[PDB]
Amino acid sequence: DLDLAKASATDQLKKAKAEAQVIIEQANKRRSQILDEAKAEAEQERTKIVAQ
Amino acid sequence: MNLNATILGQAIAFVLFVLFCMKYVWPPLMAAIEKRQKEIADGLASAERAHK
């Protein structure tokens, strides 16, 4: 019962660490999406105001 | 019945079997039982530790 418990605990922990690592990389994908859209509307704001 | 010196020779036989039983027989037997009782108790503790 102690041996089997160790194996699942490890299996559970490895799953939890995998989802947490995915969520931080998904957060960096959200960051880089937000930053590229910010850059995209900053160039577009300048170009419209000078055109104006 | 016959009042007899067998009372004295049997008192030597009695004492010598209690000294050898006290030293040699009883400490090793109780060691073996109580060591098994500890193993069973460590089994109980191990189950609780697994679920913790």
Burial zone of B38 (CB within 10 Å; 0-12 exposed, 13-18 middle, 19+ buried): exposed
**What resolution in angstroms does the PDB record give?**
3.1
Any chain A CB within 8 A of the CB of B2?
no
How far apart CA A5 and CA A11 sit, in angstroms, is 10
- Chain B residues with beta carbon closer than 8 angstroms to that of A5: 50-51
How far apart CA B46 and CA B52 sit, in angstroms, is 10
CB within 8 Å: A5 and B50: yes
Q: Give the residue among B38, B15, B37, B19 at the shortest CA–CA distance from B27.
A: B19
Q: Which helix (H) or strand (E) holds B27?
A: helix B26-51
Q: For residue A23, which phi and psi values (nearest 5 degrees)?
A: -65, -40
How far apart CA B52 and CA A38 sit, in angstroms, is 49
Residues of A (5-44) whose Cβ lies below 8 Å from B: 5
How far apart CA A32 and CA A38 sit, in angstroms, is 10
- Chain A residues with beta carbon closer than 8 angstroms to that of B46: 1-2
CB neighbour list of residue B50: distance below 8 Å, 6 or more residues apart: A1, A2, A5
- Please report, for residues A38, B13, B15, B26, the alpha-carbon distance to residue B18 in angstroms, rounded to integers and kept in the order given: 96, 9, 5, 10
CA angle B4, B10, B11 (to 5 degrees): 105
How far apart CA B8 and CA B6 sit, in angstroms, is 5
Lookup result for tokens 């193993």: B39
